């Protein structure tokens, strides 16, 4: 037995419990009218028609596309 100092920082990082935030899915307030779909997806037939195009700022994120998503307007 010589020593054990644990130079790497204190990394007891057990997973969180998913602390609840406020209610979500604020699509719109559309009473007595046509109900459309949000996050319109690509023309590729392999899209599951249930995923969300996370397009924040000129960058598009799609769950169905594993690593590549490139389209031109």
């Amino acid at each position: 037995r010589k020593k054990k100092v644990y130079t790497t920082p204190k990394k007891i990082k057990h997973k969180h419990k998913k602390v609840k935030l406020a209610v979500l899915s604020y699509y719109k307030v559309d009473a007595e009218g046509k109900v459309t779909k949000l996050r319109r997806e690509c023309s590729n037939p392999t899209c599951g028609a249930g995923v969300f195009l996370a397009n924040h700022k000129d960058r598009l994120y799609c769950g169905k596309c594993h690593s590549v998503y490139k389209v031109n307007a």
């Binding site: 037995r1 010589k2 020593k3 054990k4």
Partner: protein, 369 residues
């Protein structure tokens, strides 16, 4: 190696045979025994969290050593090294005889011979009438010459930088040749006032050095017994003055230490005040605290008030370790103290074991709640 080859237990056998071999090779690394000796240790130290290594520690002591030791045991034996570390007082021995003089130094254990010389004495017999007294006074004058030469040689080997380093001077000899040396005027005033005792030895030279140590074994220890009473004596005399510089309790006397003054700080050999280094993670705040000997083994206060978070036990450092980092700021002498003496016994049992002298009479209770 052979006697260890028939240890019944394999775990003991292999360890001892390997330990002996590793000692052998490190001794093979040394061509000769260095001065101050060579202290060797082999084994397997035990820390926490399981990362094994076999250690091999040989070093030359900073101070000369006299003890010899070889012990194979389930634990390391450092008691000789601790004693050689604690005992630092040096006592000079002067062995004066008509045949010659010797000067020696005595640490806690080791015995060194600084400088010894022989002298041809004249003939006591004068067997004259019209010149007996002239030769008798002449013979006395040569004795004075030898007394002074021994006296001046004492200053050269013991006094260094206009300060005496040896704790005390033991003047050993026979046939009244040490009484005159101690009472001689040419003998240094500081060294004469440091004369410990006169010892009647049956032999001169190195043999008288051995016998002088044997007859002065208890007195050398009693020197620290004497300086111990003197250190606290000025502390208690200032108490008997009924003056305003009275303090008690570690909680207060440490505040006095942090304020200033404190000519001398008194620290016990076996401190009862164990302190834990604390460090909070959240607020990023660092502070200093103090603890009591009796309210730390079992108390329901061991929780977090500032943040209310659990704290794992941290390795604890002594107060002497922290105070030794900056013990020179106050200039106070680090003196290990005892509790044997009755006056000291009530000081420990009534006054907290820490005291100091203030430069002037200043009020503490004036600013209090």
């Amino acid at each position: 190696f052979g006697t260890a080859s028939n240890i019944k237990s394999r775990v003991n056998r292999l360890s001892v045979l390997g330990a002996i071999t590793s000692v052998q090779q490190r001794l093979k690394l040394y061509n000769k025994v260095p001065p101050n000796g060579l202290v060797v240790y082999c084994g397997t130290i035990v820390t926490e969290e399981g990362k094994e290594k076999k250690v091999n520690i040989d070093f030359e002591p900073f101070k000369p050593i006299n003890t010899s030791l070889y012990l194979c045991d389930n634990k390391f034996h450092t008691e000789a090294l601790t004693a050689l570390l604690s005992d630092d007082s040096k006592f000079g021995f002067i062995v004066i005889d008509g045949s010659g003089a010797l000067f020696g130094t005595l640490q806690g254990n080791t015995r060194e011979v600084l400088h010894k010389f022989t002298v041809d004495l004249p003939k006591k017999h004068g067997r004259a009438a019209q010149s007996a007294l002239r030769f008798a006074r002449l013979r006395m004058e040569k004795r004075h010459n030898y007394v002074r030469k021994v006296a001046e040689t004492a200053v050269q080997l013991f006094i260094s930088g206009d300060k005496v380093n040896v704790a005390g001077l033991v003047l050993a000899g026979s046939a009244d040749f040490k009484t005159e040396l101690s009472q001689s005027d040419m003998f240094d005033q500081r060294l004469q006032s440091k004369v410990l005792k006169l010892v009647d030895i049956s032999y001169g030279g190195e043999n008288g050095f051995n016998q002088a140590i044997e007859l002065s074994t208890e007195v050398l220890s009693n020197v620290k017994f004497i300086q111990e009473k003197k250190l606290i004596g000025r502390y208690f005399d200032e108490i008997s003055q009924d003056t305003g510089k009275y303090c008690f309790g570690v909680e207060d006397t440490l505040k006095a230490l942090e304020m200033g003054a404190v000519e001398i700080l008194i620290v016990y050999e076996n401190l009862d005040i164990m302190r834990y280094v604390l460090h909070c993670q959240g607020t990023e705040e660092e502070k200093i605290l103090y603890l009591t000997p009796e309210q730390e083994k079992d108390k329901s206060h061991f929780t977090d008030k500032e943040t209310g978070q659990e704290h794992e036990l941290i390795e604890s450092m002594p107060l002497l370790e922290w105070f030794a980092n900056n013990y020179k700021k106050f200039g106070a002498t680090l003196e290990i103290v005892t509790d044997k003496s009755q006056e000291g016994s009530q000081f420990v049992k009534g006054f907290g074991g820490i005291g100091g002298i203030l430069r002037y009479r200043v009020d503490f209770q004036g600013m209090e709640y």
